[model samples]
Target: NCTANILNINEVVIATGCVPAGGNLIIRVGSDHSYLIRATVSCGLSLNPSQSFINGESLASGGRC
Candidate 1:
């Protein structure tokens, strides 16, 4: 038998906003785990070389890792 300890590292909150603006996510995993995910919404969509998961498009894209 196998037991899985599902520990919620943190909570994810999303807020809708306008274009040319930015959004952020706060995840409290630990002292080191705590991070802020910021995303910039734009009409000119492009691939972010810095981060793969982050996508810039007309739609919304911002959340915890």
Candidate 2:
């Protein structure tokens, strides 16, 4: 549950990693089924201030945090 009612934005855990990634989701090109272009969290757990979904303060900051 994290701090769903504390931080500037609602921060909640949605995976077993115990932390959320930066931003909400990615933007795919074309349509829903056909993803011509794919995006990712380039910064990963290095984003300062962090997003509402990214818990950059996790211990596992290398590789799959």
Candidate 3:
């Protein structure tokens, strides 16, 4: 359903090697401040607020929240 995943909580860096296949990759920051969030996906990736530095690509069939 998901894909390889990684999660960061109010931290500085997030490095997830490959999010391919059936797994979910998620990163959440509790701070309201501005931080550089970067992500690249060939299939699809989603970020809240829909901003730059991230790929707004779509996942497989059952990869919707």
Candidate 4:
């Protein structure tokens, strides 16, 4: 599962790269201004580059806590 850690942290950033088909990207907003990202995307294949959860063109789905 993949999720975003929406928080008011300093210099906080949530970005992504190639995620292989069926793979998932993990994100976590943690203490001490820490963060996390996991998984890899296949070459020439990736998820939709859209502003999900805010646009009708894309829909946000389940994510890890």
Candidate that beats the other on lDDT, 2 or 3, i.e. the better one: 3
* Local accuracy by lDDT, each model: 0.29, 0.23, 0.34, 0.31
Tens-digit lDDT string for candidate 4 (1-65): 23333333243333322233346443333333222323343222223344222211211223433
Off by over 4 Å in 4: 1-14, 27-65
Q: Write the per-residue lDDT of candidate 2 for residues 1-65, one digit (tens) a residue.
A: 11111111223222222124333322121212211111124433222233222223121122342
Residue by residue across 1-65, what tens digits does model 3's lDDT show?
Answer: 22323334432343332344333344433333222222354444444355433322222222323
lDDT of 2: 0.23
* lDDT string, candidate 1, 1-65, tens digits: 11111122232322232223344333232223332334455332222344332212122343322
True-vs-predicted CA distance for residue 56, candidate 4, Å? 15
Please report how far candidate 3 places residue 29 from its true position, in Å.
Answer: 2.0
> How do the predictions measure up, each by TM-score?
0.25, 0.16, 0.20, 0.19
lDDT, residue 61, candidate 2: 27
TM-score of 1: 0.25
**Off by more than 4 A, model 1:** 1-21, 30-32, 42-65
Worst 10-residue lDDT window for candidate 3 reads 53-62
**Where does candidate 4 clash, by residue pair?**
18-41, 19-40, 19-41, 20-41, 20-42
How far in Å is the alpha carbon of 44 misplaced in model 4? 13
